Amino acid sequence: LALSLTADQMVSALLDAEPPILYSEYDPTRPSEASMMGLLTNLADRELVHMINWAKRVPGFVDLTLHDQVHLLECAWLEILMIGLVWRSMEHPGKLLFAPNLLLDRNQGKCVGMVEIFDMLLATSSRFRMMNLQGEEFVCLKSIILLNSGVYTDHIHRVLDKITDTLIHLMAKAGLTLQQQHQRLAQLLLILSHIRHMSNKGMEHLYSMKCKNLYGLLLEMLDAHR
Amino acid sequence: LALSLTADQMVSALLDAEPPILYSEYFSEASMMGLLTNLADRELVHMINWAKRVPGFVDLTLHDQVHLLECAWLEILMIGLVWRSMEHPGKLLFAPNLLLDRNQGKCVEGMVEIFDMLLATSSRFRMMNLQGEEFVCLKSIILLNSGVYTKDHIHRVLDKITDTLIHLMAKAGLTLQQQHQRLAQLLLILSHIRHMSNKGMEHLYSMKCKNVPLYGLLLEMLDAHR
Amino acid sequence: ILHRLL
Amino acid sequence: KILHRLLQ
């Protein structure tokens, strides 16, 4: 099924899969660490629901057993929320756009030791901005994350191979020489190693936010990582 | 300087820079930990020397050198461990006189999960038929890439190594589609290696909190990841 | 829960 | 520091 898709068709299915951007309950009258984290965890919890329904529509995903689907999402969930975050923030140098009504710079991250995760996210957004990452490439990278993060932890590999073919096809179409397609391909996939690093750090930061007073799904996804 | 090299000379400079394989001293929890930390402390001294010989690395400033090595050191020990274990499926070859199986990993708590992930990586390298020439290219990529986001020169040198990898894959007959597919598979494994290094760093810091003693090079490198 | 929603 | 000295 997913294996018989062409590059354009893979791109159409992924762009059409994209989840909505959500609003936070940010009250800019209302001044806190508890409330700021409350606003972010409320948002992430609503985003987890749309992610689950987005994952279902990624070519190849529903061919997995329930168990495996559960597993890949347990590994990938914070990485996917993070690259989605970094992508919407691309055009706000110096800021993270948690939602259209919640744009924070790094000083507002002091409110919570979250400032170290903020800066990491800022520098990834900058990286994306330098490379002028495209919407089409972004949706490929996000699908590579879901599929790759928990794979080591076959059909999955065939599908990952197709998404690589699609990335290269986006880059030939964008006028890039053979040598440049492969370099861009490396740089894009090298960023995913940084994304995995920020997700391990953010997990540790989340765990210790709970272990010194979260929701259902979010707490569940957090506990998956022990 | 690095950038004037051909793909063939990049490979030879990297192969020749390789550290030697070290021997363990000739199992309870603390005796095992003692063997591995002593070994890891010695391998760190040769890694710093291998680093100086990686082309482009000597061109960096001293504090940038330090930053890269402090971000990357455990990923680099891990991928060398993984490479030596390739031909002993089932087992981890820490030194030629220290080949351990899965079951011996239980003599240390929290180690069994890290053991399993290392075994899965080596298993993955084994089934991709990873060659020594690709391996040296990946190891260099991890050194330049892991801390680069926390510069144009570093990116230029990574671009050089990617070209070297593709050049290796074209020499081996693979098609253009297989070349980019293979390049993708190799870099995505770096993201698992970053994940292992993060479970490994936490594990080491809590080992430090009990009491195997940690001194010298190894302690300093661990403290560098606050 | 994840199990459920999926 | 140690690291400084080995890098030179």
Numbering used by the authors:
A (entry chain A): 306 to 336, 338 to 418, 420 to 460, 473 to 532, 536 to 548
B (entry chain B): 306 to 331, 337 to 460, 472 to 532, 534 to 548
C (entry chain C): 689 to 694
D (entry chain D): 688 to 695
Give the text the authors published on this PDB structure.
The estrogen receptor α (ERα) is a ligand-activated nuclear hormone receptor and a major regulator of cell growth, survival, and metastasis in a large fraction of breast cancers. Structurally, ERα LBD is an α-helical bundle, with the C-terminal helix, H12, functioning as a key structural component of the activating function-2 (AF-2) cleft that governs the agonist or antagonist state of the receptor. The Y537S and D538G mutations are especially interesting because they occur at the N-terminus of Helix 12 (H12) in the ERα ligand-binding domain (LBD). Importantly, breast cancer cell-based studies revealed that the Y537S and D538G mutations conferred hormone-independent activation of ERα and reduced the inhibitory potency and efficacy of clinically prescribed SERMs and SERDs.
Few differences are observed between the unliganded and E2-bound D538G (Cα r.m.s.d. = 0.327 Å). The greatest conformational discrepancy between the two structures lies at Y537, which, in the unliganded structure, adopts a more WT-E2 like conformation by orienting toward H3 in chain A, thus returning the φ and ψ angles of residues 537 and 538 into the α-helical region. Y537 of chain B, however, matches the solvent-exposed orientation of the D538G-E2 structure whereby the φ and ψ angles for 537 and 538 are outside of the α-helical region. Based on this conformational asymmetry between the two monomers in apo-D538G ERα, Y537 can switch between the buried state observed in the WT-agonist structures and the solvent-exposed orientation of the D538G-E2 structure. Thus, apo D538G has lost some—but not all—of the conformational attributes of the E2-bound mutant, which is consistent with its modest level of constitutive activity. Together, these structural features agree with our biophysical data showing that D538G can adopt an agonist state in the absence of hormone that recruits coregulator with a modest affinity. The unidentified ligand is not of sufficient size to be a hormone nor is it near enough to H11 and H12 to interact with them. In contrast, the apo D538G structure shows that this mutant may use a subtler mechanism to adopt the agonist conformation in the absence of hormone.
